[PDB]
Amino acid sequence: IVGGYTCGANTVPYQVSLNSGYHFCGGSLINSQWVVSAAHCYKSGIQVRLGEDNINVVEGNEQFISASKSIVHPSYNSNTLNNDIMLIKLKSAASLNSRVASISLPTSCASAGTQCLISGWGNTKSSGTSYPDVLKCLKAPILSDSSCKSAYPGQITSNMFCAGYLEGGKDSCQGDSGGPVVCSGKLQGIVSWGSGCAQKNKPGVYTKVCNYVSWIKQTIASN
């Protein structure tokens, strides 16, 4: 997250870190057994880390649970990032508590102009590299479909939305991929892509979770 703030330990209790020997992507806990992340975060050998604040210090509220299954969307296209969504099943259910909690799936799609909370352990520099240890947060508004398509001509599908600031300076970034975009208390987006981070005229692009709720529900009813 570039241009964000330190969230505060465990104030984003649905945020997970995906670890394969090191943090490599975020995700969102949607119930005690399942995490939503980006398909482009797929790796074999994922351990889900819940209850994290500093990902390099064991502070006492973590739960580390291996994935038993990962399910990339059936129509994910890694070239365009259309349908950039994945489900990860935990080998054992998380113990839900004040620091480890699920986020609701949406019923309706979010509205342009809605301010959403985006979080992660990704790079904090637009130019260069610095990865934080503690979880960072950003409030960013959803941009109109027409502004998103103007920013990335020929690249935005109906399964993507843009959020952020066209002047630059505030965005998600590498290492935040797969993590949450929460708007009005529902998981509306997944950190997916963008040109650089926090560059002028190049807002973040996010997987539109409200298009996937029936897939998510049928898949979790069956696995």
Residue list for the binding site for Ca(2+): 52, 54, 57, 62
Q: Which of residues 56-95 bind Ca ion (CB under 5 A)?
A: 59
- Catalytic: which of 17, 70, 73, 84? 84
**Closest CB to Ca ion among 95 and 111?**
95
- Say whether residue 171 binds Ca ion (CB under 5 A): no
Q: Contacting Ca ion (CB under 5 A), which of 25, 26, 52, 208? A: 52
Token pair of 150 as six digits: 């103007």
Q: Quote the least distance from Cβ 61 to Ca ion, whole Å.
A: 8
Give the integer Cα–Cα distance in Å for 214 and 153: 29
- Catalytic: which of 40, 53, 119, 192? 40
- Annotated catalytic, 177? yes
Q: Judged by CB under 5 A, which stretch of 31-39, 47-55, 67-75, 186-194 contacts Ca ion?
A: 47-55
Question: What are the CA-CA distances from residue 153 to residues 81, 166, 192, 202 (Å)?
Answer: 14, 15, 17, 11
Token pair of 10 as six digits: 């465990």
Backbone gaps in the chain, preceding residues (C–N over 2.5 A): none
Q: Quote the least distance from Cβ 37 to Ca ion, whole Å.
A: 19
Contacts of 47 (CB under 8 A, 6+ apart): 18, 19, 20, 64, 65, 66, 67
- Say whether residue 7 binds Ca ion (CB under 5 A): no
- Annotated catalytic, 40? yes
Number of residues that bind Ca ion (CB under 5 A): 3
Nearest alpha-carbon partner for 45 in 21, 76, 12: 21
Q: Judged by CB under 5 A, which stretch of 24-32, 50-58, 102-110, 210-218 contacts Ca ion?
A: 50-58
Q: Judged by CB under 5 A, which stretch of 5-13, 51-59, 151-159, 213-221 contacts Ca ion?
A: 51-59
Give the residue ranges of the annotated binding site.
52, 54, 57, 62, 171-172, 174-175, 177
Which stretch of DSSP H or E encloses residue 41?
none
CA angle 135, 137, 142 (to 5 degrees): 145
Give the integer Cα–Cα distance in Å for 200 and 204: 11
Q: Quote the least distance from Cβ 59 to Ca ion, whole Å.
A: 5
Q: Quote the least distance from Cβ 79 to Ca ion, whole Å.
A: 35
Give the integer Cα–Cα distance in Å for 59 and 63: 11
- Annotated catalytic, 73? no
* Footprint on this chain of Ca ion (rule: CB under 5 A): 52, 54, 59
User: Which residues are catalytic, by number?
Assistant: 40, 84, 177
